[PDB]
Amino acid sequence: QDRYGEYFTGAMGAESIKKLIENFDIDAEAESLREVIRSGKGQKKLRALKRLKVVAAFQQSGNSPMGMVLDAVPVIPPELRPMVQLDGGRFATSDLNDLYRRVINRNNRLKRLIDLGAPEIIVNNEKRMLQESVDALFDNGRRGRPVTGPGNRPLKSLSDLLKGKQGRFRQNLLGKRVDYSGRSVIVVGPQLKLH
Amino acid sequence: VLRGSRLGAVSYETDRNHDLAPRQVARYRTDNGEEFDVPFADDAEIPGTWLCRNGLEGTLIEGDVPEPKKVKPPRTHWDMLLERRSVEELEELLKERLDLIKAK
Amino acid sequence: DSVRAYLKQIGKVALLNAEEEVELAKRIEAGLYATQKLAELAEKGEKLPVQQRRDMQWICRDGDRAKNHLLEANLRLVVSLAKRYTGRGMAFLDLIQEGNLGLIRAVEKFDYTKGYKFSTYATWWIRQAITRAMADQARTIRIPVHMVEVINKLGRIQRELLQDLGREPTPEELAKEMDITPEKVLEIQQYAREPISLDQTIGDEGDSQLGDFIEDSEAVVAVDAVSFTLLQDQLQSVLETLSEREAGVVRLRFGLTDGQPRTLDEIGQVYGVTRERIRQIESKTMSKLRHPSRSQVLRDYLD
Amino acid sequence: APVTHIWYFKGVPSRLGYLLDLAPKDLEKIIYFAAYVITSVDDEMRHNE
Amino acid sequence: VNFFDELRIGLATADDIRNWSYGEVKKPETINYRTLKPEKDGLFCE
DNA sequence: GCTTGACAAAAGTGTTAAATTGTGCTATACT
DNA sequence: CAATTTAACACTTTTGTCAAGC
Numbered sequence: 001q002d003r004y005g006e007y008f009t010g011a012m013g014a015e016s017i018k019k020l021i022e023n024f025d026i027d028a029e030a031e032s033l034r035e036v037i038r039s040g041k042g043q044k045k046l047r048a049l050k051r052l053k054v055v056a057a058f059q060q061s062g063n064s065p066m067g068m069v070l071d072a073v074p075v076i077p078p079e080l081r082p083m084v085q086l087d088g089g090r091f092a093t094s095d096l097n098d099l100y101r102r103v104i105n106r107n108n109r110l111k112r113l114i115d116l117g118a119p120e121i122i123v124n125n126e127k128r129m130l131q132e133s134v135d136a137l138f139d140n141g142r143r144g145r146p147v148t149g150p151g152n153r154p155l156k157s158l159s160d161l162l163k164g165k166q167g168r169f170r171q172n173l174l175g176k177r178v179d180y181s182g183r184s185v186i187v188v189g190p191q192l193k194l195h
Numbered sequence: 196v197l198r199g200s201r202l203g204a205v206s207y208e209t210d211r212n213h214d215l216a217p218r219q220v221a222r223y224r225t226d227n228g229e230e231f232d233v234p235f236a237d238d239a240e241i242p243g244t245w246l247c248r249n250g251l252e253g254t255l256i257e258g259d260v261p262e263p264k265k266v267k268p269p270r271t272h273w274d275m276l277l278e279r280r281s282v283e284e285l286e287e288l289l290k291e292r293l294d295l296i297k298a299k
Numbered sequence: 300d301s302v303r304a305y306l307k308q309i310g311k312v313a314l315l316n317a318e319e320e321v322e323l324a325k326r327i328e329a330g331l332y333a334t335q336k337l338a339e340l341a342e343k344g345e346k347l348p349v350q351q352r353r354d355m356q357w358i359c360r361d362g363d364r365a366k367n368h369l370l371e372a373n374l375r376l377v378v379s380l381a382k383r384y385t386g387r388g389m390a391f392l393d394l395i396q397e398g399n400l401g402l403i404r405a406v407e408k409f410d411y412t413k414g415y416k417f418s419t420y421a422t423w424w425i426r427q428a429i430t431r432a433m434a435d436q437a438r439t440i441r442i443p444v445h446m447v448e449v450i451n452k453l454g455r456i457q458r459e460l461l462q463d464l465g466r467e468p469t470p471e472e473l474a475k476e477m478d479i480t481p482e483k484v485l486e487i488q489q490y491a492r493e494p495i496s497l498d499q500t501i502g503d504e505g506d507s508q509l510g511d512f513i514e515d516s517e518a519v520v521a522v523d524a525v526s527f528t529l530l531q532d533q534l535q536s537v538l539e540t541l542s543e544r545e546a547g548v549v550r551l552r553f554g555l556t557d558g559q560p561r562t563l564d565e566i567g568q569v570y571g572v573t574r575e576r577i578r579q580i581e582s583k584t585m586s587k588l589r590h591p592s593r594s595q596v597l598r599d600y601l602d
Numbered sequence: 603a604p605v606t607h608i609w610y611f612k613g614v615p616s617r618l619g620y621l622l623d624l625a626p627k628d629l630e631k632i633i634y635f636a637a638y639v640i641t642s643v644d645d646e647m648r649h650n651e
Numbered sequence: 652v653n654f655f656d657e658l659r660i661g662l663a664t665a666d667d668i669r670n671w672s673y674g675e676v677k678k679p680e681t682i683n684y685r686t687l688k689p690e691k692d693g694l695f696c697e
Numbered sequence: 698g699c700t701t702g703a704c705a706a707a708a709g710t711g712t713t714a715a716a717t718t719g720t721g722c723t724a725t726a727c728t
Numbered sequence: 729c730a731a732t733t734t735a736a737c738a739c740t741t742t743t744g745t746c747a748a749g750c
Contacts, residue, residue: 009642012635014606019641021622029623054620067662068610068618074668075676078695083682084199084497084513091440091494092199092509097681097694098439102390104679104694105436109397110603119367121374122399125305127603128635129392132301135608142612144301149496156498166508198514202682202689205517207527214557250675272407273335276328279410285332289358292329296354304636314728376728404721413724420724427722441680441690443718490684562743576699578744685717700750707743716734 013127018069026059073134075100076158095155099137099147106130225251302392309374321411323369330362369406369417376418377402380425388437394429401428439494450491453477453484530600537593545584552581606633 001010011019033055036048058065081096110126132143140146140157149155162169217237223245224230231247243261247253254261280288315323333355340347347355381394405421413420434447442450456476460468470481477484497510538546538555548570554560563574563581570577588594610617611633616626624632631637680693689695 004648007644007648008640010638010640012632012638014604014633016632016639016641017606017618017622017629018604020639024622029621050615051620051623054615054617058621061661063662064664065621065662067664068607069604070607070668071604071665072668072675073605074671075694079201082201082497083494083695084201085687086197086199086513089489090492092497092513093439093494093681094497094510100676100694101439101679101681104676105393108677108679109400113400116403118399118403119370121308121371122396124635125308126396128304129396130603131605131633134605138608139612142608150493151496153496153499165505196512198516200516202687202695203517205519207524208558209528209531210558246674248672248674249669250677273331275407276331280328285328288325288329289332289336292326292358293354296357304634373728379728408722409724415724416726418727422727423723431720436679440682440684442684444720445718446684564743572698573700574743575701575745579699698750701748703747704745705743706745707741709741710739712737714734714736716732718730718732720730 013124014069014131018066021066021069024065026055026065029055030059070134073103073137095149096158098149099133099140099155099157102133103130103137106133221245222256223247223253224256225249225253227251229253302395305392305395306378309371309378312368312371312374314375315369315372315417317416320369320417323365324409324411324417326365327362327369327406330359330365333358333362366406370403373402373406373417373421374399376421377425380422381429384429384433387433389433393436394432397432398425398429401425404428442490446490450487453487453491526600530597533597533600537588537596540593541584541587545580545587548577548580549584549588 009019010016030052033048033052036042036044037052039045076096078097081094083091083093083097085091106126106129110123110130113123113126135143136147136155136157138157139159140155146154161167165171218234219237219239220232220234221241222230222232225247227249229247229249229251231245231249231253233245235241241255243255243258244252244264245255337355337359377398378395381391381398384394385391401424402421405417405424408424409417409420431444434444435441437447453473457468457473460472460476464472470485473484474481495509498508501507501509501512538549541549548566550556551561551566551569552563563577566577567574572580606618611629616629619626619629628637632639674696676694676696677692678690680690681695682689682693689697
C-alpha cells in the first residue's frame with residue numbers, strides 16, 4: 001500500500017466482497033463455464049458443470065446477486081416474539097428479542113467507534129463482532145458452537161423456527177386443535193340402527 | 196395451567212368510517228432526498244421536523260426555515276487538552292518538537 | 300471460542316517501556332497543537348512557508364500515528380481487566396471491546412507531568428467503562444445505573460447475612476442493614492428478578508415449549524363480543540321507544556351518537572335550553588327509563 | 603457496515619463462492635477479517651510506469 | 652382474498668427490507684422496569 | 698316548560714418540592 | 729452533580745345543583 005497504493009485497491013471483510021461483486025459481470029462467468037463444459041475432455045468439466053448451475057441461476061430471472069450482502073436487516077413484529085407477564089408478575093420472553101438486542105448493541109458501538117477514528121485493530125474487530133452477531137441471529141450454530149445466553153441451552157434463531165420438528169413447516173401440517181369437539185369412552189349399543 | 200397477558204387490553208367497539216376525525220396530511224423531506232407523508236388531525240400544530248420511516252429527521256416543506264432546534268456544541272480532544280495545558284506551554288512544546296525534525 | 304484471533308492480532312505489538320509512554324504522549328500533544336495551528340491560521344490568511352507547512356503537517360501525522368501506536372500497545376491491558384468481569388451477563392469479547400472505549404478516553408486524558416505510569420490512570424477509566432457497560436446492557440429489561448448499584452448492594456449484604464444466619468433472611472432483617480423499610484427491599488427484590496425464556500421446553504421432553512400452553516387473559520371472548528352488540532341494539536330499541544325530544548338528550552349526554560360525553564351546557568348548543576333545564580329533562584327521561592316498564596327489558600345485561 | 607447473508611456463505615455448496623469463484627475456507631478468512639484480498643488492479647495505470 | 656394464483660419466493664434486497672419497515676430500531680431496550688411501558692425507540696416501540 | 702340567581706364540588710393551570718435518571722471522573726502500580 | 733420527570737399544592741374556571749317564580 002505504501003509503495004504502490006495509487007495503482008491497486010485492497011480490502012477485507014464483507015465490504016471487500018460487496019466491492020468485488022459490485023462490478024462483477026455475470027455473463028462472462030457463464031460463457032467461460034459453458035466453454036469449459038464444451039471442452040469436456042478436461043477433468044475440470046465436472047467442477048465447471050457444478051458451478052454453472054448456480055451461475056446460470058443468478059444469470060436468469062433478472063434479479064441481481066448483490067442480495068447476498070445486507071445493508072439492512074428486517075425486524076419481526078413484536079407479538080411474534082412477545083414478552084408476557086405470567087400470573088404472579090414473573091415475565092417470560094422469547095429468545096429472538098435477545099438476539100436482535102445484540103445486533104442493535106454491536107452496531108451502535110461500531111457507529112460510535114468509527115466516529116472517533118479508532119485504530120483499525122479495534123474497528124475491524126468490531127465489524128467481525130457485528131457480522132458474527134448477525135450470523136447468529138439468522139442461523140445460530142452455523143458458525144460453530146452456538147450462543148447460549150441464560151442457562152446452558154442454545155438460543156433459538158429465526159431459522160430454528162422453520163427448521164426443526166417445531167416450526168411452521170413441520171408442525172403446521174400436523175393439524176390443529178379444533179373447538180366444537182369432544183372425546184369419550186365407548187360401549188356397545190346393540191339396539192342402535194346402523195346410522 | 197398458567198395464564199398471562201400482553202401489554203395491553205382489547206376493546207369491543209364496532210363503529211366504522213361513518214365517524215370521521217378531521218385530518219390533514221403534512222409533507223416532509225429527509226437528507227437523502229426521500230419524501231414522506233404524515234396524516235395529522237385538524238388541530239394541527241404540525242411540527243417542523245419529523246422522524247420518518249427511513250430514520251432521518253426530515254424537515255417540513257411549507258416553511259422556508261424550520262425551528263432552529265439549536266443545541267450545544269460537542270466536546271473534542273483538543274478542547275479537553277486545553278483544560279490541562281496552557282497555550283504558552285503548547286508553544287514551547289511545538290518549539291521543542293520542531294527542533295528535532297529541523298536537525299536533519 | 301473464537302476470541303483467539305483478537306489475542307493473536309494484538310500480540311504483534313510489544314509493550315512500552317517507562318520512557319516511551321511520555322514520548323508518545325508528548326508527540327500526541329504536539330501533533331494536536333500543530334493541527335490546531337493549521338486550522339486556526341487559515342481564518343485570517345497568514346501563509347506559512349512551504350518548508351514549515353510540510354514540517355508541521357508531518358508533525359500532525361506523527362502525532363496521529365503516535366496516538367494510534369499508544370492505543371495499540373495498550374490494547375493488551377484491557378483484556379486482563381475484562382477477564383475479571385466475564386460471566387456477569389455480558390459477553391467476554393463485548394466487555395473487551397467496550398473497555399477499549401474507556402481506554403481511548405484514558406489516552407485522551409493521560410498526561411506525563413503527573414509523573415505516573417499510563418496503566419495507573421488507564422485502569423480506572425477501563426474499569427468504570429466496563430462497569431457502566433455491564434450495568435446498561437446486562438439485562439433484557441433495562442435497569443438504570445443507580446438501581447443496579449442498590450441491587451448489587453442488597454445482594455452483597457444478603458450474601459453475608461445468609462452466610463452468618465445460615466438461611467435466607469426475612470425482609471426486616473435486610474431492612475435493618477439497608478436503612479430502608481422492609482417493603483422497600485421486598486420491592487427491590489421484585490425489580491431484580493430476571494424474565495424466564497419463553498422457548499424453554501416443558502413436559503420433561505421435547506414435545507412442546509412453555510409458550511405453547513399460556514392461556515391469554517385478555518382474549519376476545521365470543522359470547523361477550525356478540526352480547527355487547529345485542530345490548531347496543533336493545534338499548535337503542537328502548538331509546539327509540541322515547542320521543543326524539545327525550546332521546547336526543549340522553550344520546551348526547553352519554554355520547555352514544557358520536558362516542559364523546561357532553562356536559563349539560565354543551566347539549567344546549569343544538570337544543571337551546573339552559574343547562575339547568577337540560578338537567579331537568581335528563582332527570583325526567585332518567586326516571587322514565589328506570590321505571591319497571593322498561594328496566595326489565597335490559598336489566599340482566601349488567602353482569 | 604455490510605454483512606453477508608450466512609445462508610449463502612455456508613451453503614454446502616457455498617453459492618457465494620461458486621458465483622464469485624473463491625473456494626471455501628478462503629471466503630471464511632475473507633469474511634471474518636483474517637486475510638486481505640485485492641479488489642482491483644489498475645493494469646493500464648501500472649503499465650504506464 | 653383466496654383468489655391466489657401462485658406464490659413466489661426470491662432474494663430480498665436492501666430496498667425491499669427498507670420498504671417493508673415502518674421505522675428502524677435505534678436502541679436495544681425493550682420495556683421500562685417501573686411503568687412496564689414500551690420504550691421510546693426500543694424493540695417494542697409503539 | 699323554562700330562565701335566573703346563587704352556591705359548592707370537581708377539575709384544569711401553573712409553581713415547585715421531591716424523586717428519578719444520565720453522565721464525567723477517581724493519577725502507586727497492574728498489559 | 730445536573731437534568732429530567734413525578735408528584736403535592738394553591739388558585740381559577742368550569743360542572744353540577746337547589747329554589748323562586750315567571
